[PDB]
Design an enzyme around this catalytic site. Sequence first.
Site, PDB file in Angstrom:
ATOM      1  N   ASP A  96      -4.063  18.737 -20.412  1.00  0.00           N
ATOM      2  CA  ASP A  96      -5.256  18.061 -20.908  1.00  0.00           C
ATOM      3  C   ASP A  96      -5.877  17.206 -19.809  1.00  0.00           C
ATOM      4  O   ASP A  96      -5.425  16.080 -19.565  1.00  0.00           O
ATOM      5  CB  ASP A  96      -4.875  17.190 -22.102  1.00  0.00           C
ATOM      6  N   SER A 136     -23.897  17.696 -14.637  1.00  0.00           N
ATOM      7  CA  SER A 136     -24.501  19.014 -14.554  1.00  0.00           C
ATOM      8  C   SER A 136     -25.990  18.877 -14.274  1.00  0.00           C
ATOM      9  O   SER A 136     -26.638  17.912 -14.683  1.00  0.00           O
ATOM     10  CB  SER A 136     -24.275  19.765 -15.871  1.00  0.00           C
TER      11      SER A 136
END
Length: 330
Positions: free
Chosen positions: A35, A199
Amino acid sequence: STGSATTTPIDSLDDAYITPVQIGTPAQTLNLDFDTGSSDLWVFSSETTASEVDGQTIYTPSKSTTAKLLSGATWSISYGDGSSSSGDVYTDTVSVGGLTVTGQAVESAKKVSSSFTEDSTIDGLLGLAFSTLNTVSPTQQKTFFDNAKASLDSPVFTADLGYHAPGTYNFGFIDTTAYTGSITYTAVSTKQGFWEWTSTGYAVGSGTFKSTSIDGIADTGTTLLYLPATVVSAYWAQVSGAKSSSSVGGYVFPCSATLPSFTFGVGSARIVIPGDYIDFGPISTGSSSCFGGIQSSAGIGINIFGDVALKAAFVVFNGATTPTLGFASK
């Protein structure tokens, strides 16, 4: 040193991926959920409340000649999905794919929430976010990667998750045969303890690319892609009959639909998520309403590039003094 381990989807939907991890001496192999959005290595154990164990493999520290109780240390964690776990702490030898760390903090669960009990395939979590998020008290502990870093050939790990198939976690090296083209690196902020990046935009299907900054985290422990409501609405508007269902908890779509791809930007590069990766199947057995793999982050507080996005890429988690993330197509 290096390590390399195969990671395997737990079910036919790729809801999560499990990677075998050797703990203790002799080794006890547990299948952990790696994770990158958390920083605790915790396991089902011989200390876990018996009614809360249902099929998981447990770590028994008393059977490990290298286990040592970390005196006074406790841990307690709550995840973004509402699940939680808590317990005490041992140090022991932990190996992943041939890479060994001695003295790793292994957090033994005394209590786990129902969602963990109900998933027999996941024996615990191995956190790969920054150690500043580790929950051990009163002395915070380091992640497996943080402990291994100085010994690695290069201070990196890579995630290569498969679509409906196994993939690979590598430590200490970048397998140049595992991706196409080049890896585009992008800046990371560690201020929240995550692999947080920005992004450069998105496209839906064959549509035009929208240049827009989307800050979010690269999180292998989250199944879906959680993005701003504007972006998510633009995606599902291209699927006839798709709608947000408050009762189901997100966007659903007719199982008869063909889903468009979704592209996200990494600098000037583009990662394409095929439409099929966005199908999470019937909302309940036999239903013709299917659950979408792109959902709104509006109620989270952060955008999350979970497995839906990451499995479309070869992802480099560069843990150099100034960390960065790399993405390549594959």
